[PDB]
Scaffold this active site. Structure first.
Site, PDB file in Angstrom:
ATOM      1  N   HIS A 103      -2.266  -3.029  -3.609  1.00 41.29           N
ATOM      2  CA  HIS A 103      -3.675  -2.849  -3.283  1.00 41.29           C
ATOM      3  C   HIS A 103      -4.470  -2.623  -4.572  1.00 41.29           C
ATOM      4  CE1 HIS A 103      -6.715  -0.947  -0.229  1.00 41.29           C
ATOM      5  NE2 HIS A 103      -7.142  -2.078  -0.764  1.00 41.29           N
ATOM      6  N   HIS A 134       0.845  -1.189   0.000  1.00 39.76           N
ATOM      7  CA  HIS A 134       0.000   0.000   0.000  1.00 39.76           C
ATOM      8  C   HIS A 134       0.885   1.246   0.000  1.00 39.76           C
ATOM      9  CE1 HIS A 134      -3.842  -1.960   1.400  1.00 39.76           C
ATOM     10  NE2 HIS A 134      -2.989  -2.838   1.897  1.00 39.76           N
ATOM     11  N   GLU A 188       2.379  -0.661   4.469  1.00 34.03           N
ATOM     12  CA  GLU A 188       2.121   0.662   3.921  1.00 34.03           C
ATOM     13  C   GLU A 188       3.430   1.381   3.718  1.00 34.03           C
ATOM     14  OE1 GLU A 188      -0.635   2.452   3.402  1.00 34.03           O
ATOM     15  OE2 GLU A 188      -2.259   1.429   4.433  1.00 34.03           O
ATOM     16  N   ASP A 238      -3.201   2.760  -4.964  1.00 40.42           N
ATOM     17  CA  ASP A 238      -1.939   2.522  -4.270  1.00 40.42           C
ATOM     18  C   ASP A 238      -1.420   1.098  -4.541  1.00 40.42           C
ATOM     19  OD1 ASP A 238      -4.179   1.704  -2.213  1.00 40.42           O
ATOM     20  OD2 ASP A 238      -2.533   1.396  -0.922  1.00 40.42           O
TER      21      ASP A 238
HETATM   22  C1  LIG Z   1      -5.369   1.046   5.934  1.00 38.98           C
HETATM   23  C2  LIG Z   1      -5.940   0.526   4.655  1.00 38.98           C
HETATM   24  N1  LIG Z   1      -4.995   0.691   3.571  1.00 38.98           N
HETATM   25  C3  LIG Z   1      -7.220   1.230   4.323  1.00 38.98           C
HETATM   26  O1  LIG Z   1      -7.423   2.341   4.756  1.00 38.98           O
HETATM   27  N2  LIG Z   1      -8.040   0.748   3.246  1.00 38.98           N
HETATM   28  C4  LIG Z   1      -9.412   0.357   3.464  1.00 38.98           C
HETATM   29  C5  LIG Z   1      -9.449  -0.968   4.206  1.00 38.98           C
HETATM   30  C6  LIG Z   1     -10.695  -1.214   5.052  1.00 38.98           C
HETATM   31  C7  LIG Z   1     -10.969  -2.592   5.627  1.00 38.98           C
HETATM   32  O2  LIG Z   1     -10.150  -3.498   5.532  1.00 38.98           O
HETATM   33  N3  LIG Z   1     -12.288  -2.836   6.214  1.00 38.98           N
HETATM   34  C8  LIG Z   1     -12.574  -4.113   6.808  1.00 38.98           C
HETATM   35  C9  LIG Z   1     -13.366  -3.940   8.099  1.00 38.98           C
HETATM   36  C10 LIG Z   1     -13.219  -2.638   8.846  1.00 38.98           C
HETATM   37  C11 LIG Z   1     -13.466  -2.681  10.331  1.00 38.98           C
HETATM   38  C12 LIG Z   1     -14.220  -3.996  10.882  1.00 38.98           C
HETATM   39  N4  LIG Z   1     -13.401  -5.274  10.656  1.00 38.98           N
HETATM   40  C13 LIG Z   1     -14.482  -3.803  12.396  1.00 38.98           C
HETATM   41  O3  LIG Z   1     -14.433  -4.815  13.125  1.00 38.98           O
HETATM   42  O4  LIG Z   1     -14.723  -2.646  12.775  1.00 38.98           O
HETATM   43  C14 LIG Z   1     -13.339  -5.013   5.800  1.00 38.98           C
HETATM   44  O5  LIG Z   1     -13.721  -4.569   4.718  1.00 38.98           O
HETATM   45  O6  LIG Z   1     -13.485  -6.282   6.175  1.00 38.98           O
HETATM   46  C15 LIG Z   1     -10.119   0.088   2.102  1.00 38.98           C
HETATM   47  O7  LIG Z   1      -9.451  -0.319   1.120  1.00 38.98           O
HETATM   48  O8  LIG Z   1     -11.399   0.285   2.108  1.00 38.98           O
HETATM   49  C1  LIG Z   2      -9.076   7.152  -1.216  1.00 36.10           C
HETATM   50  C2  LIG Z   2      -8.925   6.291  -0.001  1.00 36.10           C
HETATM   51  O1  LIG Z   2      -9.719   5.299   0.086  1.00 36.10           O
HETATM   52  N1  LIG Z   2      -8.469   6.864   1.192  1.00 36.10           N
HETATM   53  C3  LIG Z   2      -7.041   7.157   1.544  1.00 36.10           C
HETATM   54  C4  LIG Z   2      -7.106   8.066   2.786  1.00 36.10           C
HETATM   55  O2  LIG Z   2      -5.827   8.201   3.395  1.00 36.10           O
HETATM   56  C5  LIG Z   2      -5.847   7.559   4.643  1.00 36.10           C
HETATM   57  C6  LIG Z   2      -7.025   6.578   4.528  1.00 36.10           C
HETATM   58  O3  LIG Z   2      -7.914   7.421   3.791  1.00 36.10           O
HETATM   59  C7  LIG Z   2      -6.591   5.388   3.650  1.00 36.10           C
HETATM   60  O4  LIG Z   2      -7.749   4.549   3.628  1.00 36.10           O
HETATM   61  C8  LIG Z   2      -6.503   5.771   2.099  1.00 36.10           C
HETATM   62  O5  LIG Z   2      -5.883   4.952   1.171  1.00 36.10           O
HETATM   63  C9  LIG Z   2      -4.751   4.470   0.519  1.00 36.10           C
HETATM   64  C10 LIG Z   2      -3.837   5.255  -0.421  1.00 36.10           C
HETATM   65  C11 LIG Z   2      -4.214   3.014   0.962  1.00 36.10           C
HETATM   66  O6  LIG Z   2      -5.144   2.201   1.141  1.00 36.10           O
HETATM   67  O7  LIG Z   2      -3.042   2.774   1.109  1.00 36.10           O
HETATM   68 ZN   LIG Z   3      -4.073   0.588  -0.011  1.00 35.44          ZN
END
Ligand SMILES: C[C@H](N)C(=O)N[C@H](CCC(=O)N[C@@H](CCC[C@@H](N)C(=O)O)C(=O)O)C(=O)O
Ligand SMILES: CC(=O)N[C@H]1[C@@H]2OC[C@@H](O2)[C@@H](O)[C@@H]1O[C@@H](C)C(=O)O
Ligand SMILES: [Zn+2]
Length: 179
Positions: free
Chosen positions: A154, A34, A116, A164
């Site tokens: 990602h 990421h 990350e 990313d």
């Molecule tokens: C840090 C990371 N790169 C980020 O911000 N990306 C987010 C990642 C978001 C992510 O993994 N949600 C999880 C669950 C979120 C919280 C949930 N388990 C709880 O218990 O509260 C999912 O979908 O199962 C993105 O891609 O939407």
């Molecule tokens: C566009 C996007 O979904 N949000 C950025 C932002 O910056 C912090 C937090 O929100 C993180 O979820 C993120 O993502 C990227 C680049 C990642 O998943 O690495």
């Molecule tokens: Zn990411």
């Protein structure tokens, strides 16, 4: 470098409440690369740590209000100067991938480790970041041999949702450093 009970032997430990169990405590087999920067395009803040530990101030920057509602984390952050910070032990499920698919399998959080890189899709990552990403990856490969065959961005598991680590991430240089 070495692994100690799911924790990098050599990393700043910033243990986050943002994790749960992998289904049936499965071994991770996928590395997801990421990038992150907070505010967007800026480096060096406390904001990444705060986001991944659930304590971010929604008011400290216009960008933060929007992501305050998120519940996310990654296993490690590698900062611009190479500093490695670990939030979640590798055996546990960090919340870094969101809705995603790899080789037909969804919910990549389940079986992946998320690292990350502090940075952006369009700016080069630093020499320190490549060196450190490699060291961490080599460690992970020792513990989880399947990762050697499974390293991705990602953007590759959530295409057209995530960009990313972007074109700036030099897969050739990285892979050359690994195992
Ligand atoms: C840090 C990371 N790169 C980020 O911000 N990306 C987010 C990642 C978001 C992510 O993994 N949600 C999880 C669950 C979120 C919280 C949930 N388990 C709880 O218990 O509260 C999912 O979908 O199962 C993105 O891609 O939407
Ligand atoms: C566009 C996007 O979904 N949000 C950025 C932002 O910056 C912090 C937090 O929100 C993180 O979820 C993120 O993502 C990227 C680049 C990642 O998943 O690495
Ligand atoms: Zn990411």
């Amino acid at each position: 470098m070495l692994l100690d009970e799911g924790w990098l032997a050599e990393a700043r430990r910033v243990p986050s409440p943002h994790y749960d169990c992998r289904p049936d405590d499965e071994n991770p087999s996928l590395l997801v690369v990421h990038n992150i920067s907070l505010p967007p395009g800026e480096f060096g803040g406390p904001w990444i740590d705060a986001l991944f530990t659930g304590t971010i101030d929604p008011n400290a920057h216009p960008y933060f209000a929007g992501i305050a509602h998120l519940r996310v984390s990654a296993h490690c952050l590698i900062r611009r100067d190479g500093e490695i910070v670990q939030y979640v032990p590798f055996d546990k499920r960090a919340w870094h991938a969101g809705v995603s698919s790899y080789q037909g399998r969804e919910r990549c959080n389940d079986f992946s480790i998320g690292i990350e890189l502090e940075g952006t899709d369009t700016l080069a990552y630093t020499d320190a970041q490549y060196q450190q990403l490699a060291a961490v990856t080599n460690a992970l490969i020792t513990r989880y041999p399947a990762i050697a065959n499974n390293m991705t961005g990602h953007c590759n598991i959530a295409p057209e949702r995530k960009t990313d680590p972007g074109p700036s991430f030099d897969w050739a240089r990285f892979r050359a450093l690994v195992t």
